[PDB]
């Protein structure tokens, strides 16, 4: 979910 999308994006 979204926490991992933030991790990948940053």
């Amino acid at each position, epitope marked *: *979910s*979204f*926490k991992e999308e*933030l*991790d990948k994006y940053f």
Partner: antibody
Amino acid sequence: EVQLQQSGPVLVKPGASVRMSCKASGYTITDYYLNWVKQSHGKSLEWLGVLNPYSGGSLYSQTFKGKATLTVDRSSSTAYLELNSLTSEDSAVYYCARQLGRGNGLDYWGQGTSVTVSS
Amino acid sequence: NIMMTQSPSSLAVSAGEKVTMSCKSSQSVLHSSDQKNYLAWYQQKPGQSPKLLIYWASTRESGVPDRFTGSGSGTDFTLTISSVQAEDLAVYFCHQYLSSYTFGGGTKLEIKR
């Protein structure tokens, strides 16, 4: 000094689109991410998404996916937020806010752009 | 999304009094790779943009007066102002950035005189 200078207030009709700007000065724009955050009625805060000025790539809240478009002109150190299909519920102050990296808070905010959507 | 709930909605104190305000998250905001709570507090004075006070739940941002202290872990966070000054009137927001960013509804600090 760091500054984020946002474009001025605007009136737009329902169904139209609007694009507003956020110009970074006092620092190199590609050194920090830029977030956009909506404030309704001077209080409630809602995140739209985040752009990376270096790559130009963005990550959006599911709420704003396909509604907001984040872009950047690195040459003029200026970020842009475009909103489409505007409704009365899109009237708000839109802030841009810099974020150094994943773990950081939003350490500096522009002065906001007031958008009114009305007939 | 992680839901942020702040209490009280507003409070009023005289200058020099200590205040505490609460921010609860609906789930943990602890980021595993750095073991930091991805929780920030902002101060928004009337007519101004929000100003970052605290991040990682308890680390004060440079230039923030030391009367402001963030604390807490798990789902329960607190902002304490040790000795309120007249210029501290503002709406104070919490913010989680572990997942899709969300903010609390704010606590409005008013001043008694």
